[PDB]
Point group: D2
Chain length 275, copies 4
């Protein structure tokens, strides 16, 4: 039943496993109804969406925990969580963070080597503090590297090896621009590799068939839905403010039955009927 | 500063005052950029959006307070909050609720007589307890009622005046299909009336001009933006799952520059 | 799992002494004193954490925060006072049960308070609670004040119905004879908890006495909390009257004792 | 409608003003009933009491905000809060922290030059960041410093003036063991001075009369009640576990009537 076991189970059943970001509980339920087997909580999303703040280390662990509980309290899909760099320079912080996130209901989390990026040894220690704090061995500790933004592939691969040896269960190579690169991290790391297919990034919009050819274990789409959600919302605000009526925007609105079906409204009423 | 004043001022410079719901802090900033002068925190939205639950009284005051702080901590627009029956029951419950919501950063809130509905008497105490707990007199205490559709016009208007005599600063009649109804409340209650122009309900999609002729002081669009964001999010999930790529939905996605600007990324 | 730890403590101690801990610190003091299980008093969350009377003012969120604080640092299984489920519908009870378990609790008790609800209503609450539980080892205890409110027959009839409904253990109030506890144990056929709180109508039974009565758990809900309030008050009064705390230094836990209790040096 | 004003008024009314720590809402009420005009939320107390953790930077702002709301939601006494260094490291972090603490209900807070201590310039920027985030000019921003011990008197007095010029409404200087030294700091800073009269420390247990003679504006007792409550609780746990009954500690327990009275039980039941 362990959410961590659920995540790993998802991986074994889907390759590459599509993991979509869910900005809130409602969207996690939509993703589930769409067929997805796992979801994601973006840190930049918590900041930009939940707090309306830029992703400049302004949001706190508590902001993230709150969204983790909301999402997992109602959606059973294993949730991968963006734990940034650990929320705290102290090892105690990295540890309290890992335990808090797991306790909030997350199935997995990824911690990065950013400060520019810290040294291999540094990250290796962070990873160790994380693996140590974990209680449920099935809970996934993913190690993310942003080395490709400031270093070369070879250097990034060197880290990838040290991060795995450090205990990292899976690898998250950021900003990969070539399909062949994914293959090299896989062959070198020997653990599941996640491809971050976020739009407006350096990484091309690879298809799942392309990622599969590169042995990619996971395809992540962190803010996709959020992005379309914002545009549609903005449209409603503009049209409504210009015409003094939302009449010409009704057509792009989820209906009552659709909303109700996504949140299992009828099922709740059913239980009441039974009484 | 007093958001209660900002709210009162807003109704003064805009008639009817358009108040749009904002499901989260981000959308509050969007509504602000769109030019709105006041926003709303829908209770059904906190449940459906923040919790992914139906509007069956499962959400808690704390769930609501979290969204209030998030929104009001970054957006200065006056926020009207849906506080239901006070989530408690006794006088001290309504007070703690009103105080908490005010402390959280809201500018106004509305409580309702919907338990069937409570007797005129208990609603009167409800309003009194609410008004008494108020610290800043500029904080708005709105009363929402459904007596019209339950007891009838005569009874509805009776409650209306009572609710006003109890101290309610504004009235929120629910499920109004005829504009005449709004006028009767405005003439009887003689306090700013709010029209809930939500979609897929029993109320027609009245325009701002139509509401003005009915003497409506506020036009409410509780979930409008929310409904559109869900359809858009659903479209993205569906296409991505079918096609294995989001290439064909990029066109309906807010761009990086657009996002960064809505949250003043460059300013930081 | 916490539920397993609770049942493990129960299987190894008879009766199992369960002491209330008002906060994380005291949870550690209890652990150091040798207790195998601790308690989170609902009245303690209200009076201690909120400074309010136990009259339905505290919320589920207040309780959850204390559960996380305590269980994040103390591994002793924690029994939680979930009042009536913090809501009327089975939906509320369901959300409450999952949240409390998620926060780290090992068990919780729910009561038939409204006077009390009908046997049928409580049966539904219990079923809703049992249905919401995911880990069968998580304990769902039924608390009932039927003996005092309705009488022996009513209490025993309800006790049986509550067990059939899925309640793992029973918390019957107002019993004043060890012989009556045996009767409840024989009829319910599930572990019985005896509330040994102070200043009430019930006797301060010893663990040996409770054992002779077939009582499985002995509860001391606010015992430590009571002694802590008196000591704190003594400090405040002397300090105020004398302009220094010199004369109350002798009743203070030392810095070394504090450090020892929270494993300061270990972290250092 | 300003806890900041209430704090300043308490200062003017009582000199030195006794500020006692309250580990939770209940004790805030006990302090209020004992007659105190201001209370304190110790950072060390939030960690050791609310979290059962050492005061080594493990607690978060959220843990503090929760206790602030709980306390100020029921007790009207102005509350001074220990905000450490602003929980974070950026000007945006100090600002968000200052704002949230005030929004949570506090009347004042203090930040320190702790990193060794940061440079005078570093601290000056923190203070300025806090003062600018402040929405109510009455909300008090206190600067805590341990420069006397770390860098010596010349440097400490220098930072003090610099901190005040930066906007600190009050000063909280550590490591002072002599009245004459408090006197000197007060003369230089020209703002209200707080003396930390915590126990089991280097500082003597100065009396209010002695502190008044030292130009000290506030007397702080950060964990006094907390210390006594822990010992009492430990006593109950121990005796109870050892004897299988709490009969022999009933004598040191606050009764139910006393508890009810301290939290105005009957005034609420009157409303119910």
């Amino acid at each position: 039943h362990s959410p961590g076991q659920a995540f790993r189970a998802a991986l074994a059943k889907e390759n590459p496993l599509q993991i979509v970001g869910a900005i809130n509980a409602n969207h996690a339920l939509l993703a589930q109804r769409a067929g997805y087997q796992a979801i994601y909580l973006s840190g930049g999303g918590v900041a930009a969406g939940s707090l309306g703040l830029p992703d400049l280390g302004i949001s706190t662990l508590d902001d993230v925990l709150t969204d983790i509980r909301r999402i997992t309290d109602v959606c059973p899909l294993p949730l991968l969580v963006d734990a940034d760099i650990g929320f705290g320079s102290s090892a105690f912080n990295v540890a309290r963070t890992v335990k808090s996130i797991a306790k909030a209901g997350a199935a997995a989390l990824h911690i990065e080597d950013q400060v520019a990026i810290v040294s291999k040894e540094e990250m290796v220690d962070r990873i160790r503090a994380a693996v140590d704090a974990r209680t449920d061995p099935n809970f996934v500790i993913m190690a993310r590297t942003d080395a490709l933004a400031v270093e070369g592939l070879e250097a990034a691969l060197d880290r990838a090896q040290a991060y795995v040896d450090a205990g990292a269960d899976m690898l998250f190579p950021e900003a990969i621009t070539e399909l062949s690169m994914y293959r090299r991290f896989a062959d070198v790391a020997q653990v599941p590799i996640l491809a971050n297919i976020t739009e407006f990034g350096a990484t091309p919009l690879f298809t799942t068939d392309e990622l599969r050819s590169a042995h990619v274990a996971m395809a992540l789409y962190p803010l996709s839905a959020f992005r379309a959600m914002n545009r549609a919302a903005e449209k409603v605000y503009t049209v409504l403010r210009q015409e003094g009526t939302q009449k010409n925007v009704i057509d792009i609105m989820q209906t009552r039955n659709e909303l109700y079906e996504s949140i299992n409204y009828y099922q709740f009423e059913e239980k009441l009927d039974a009484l």
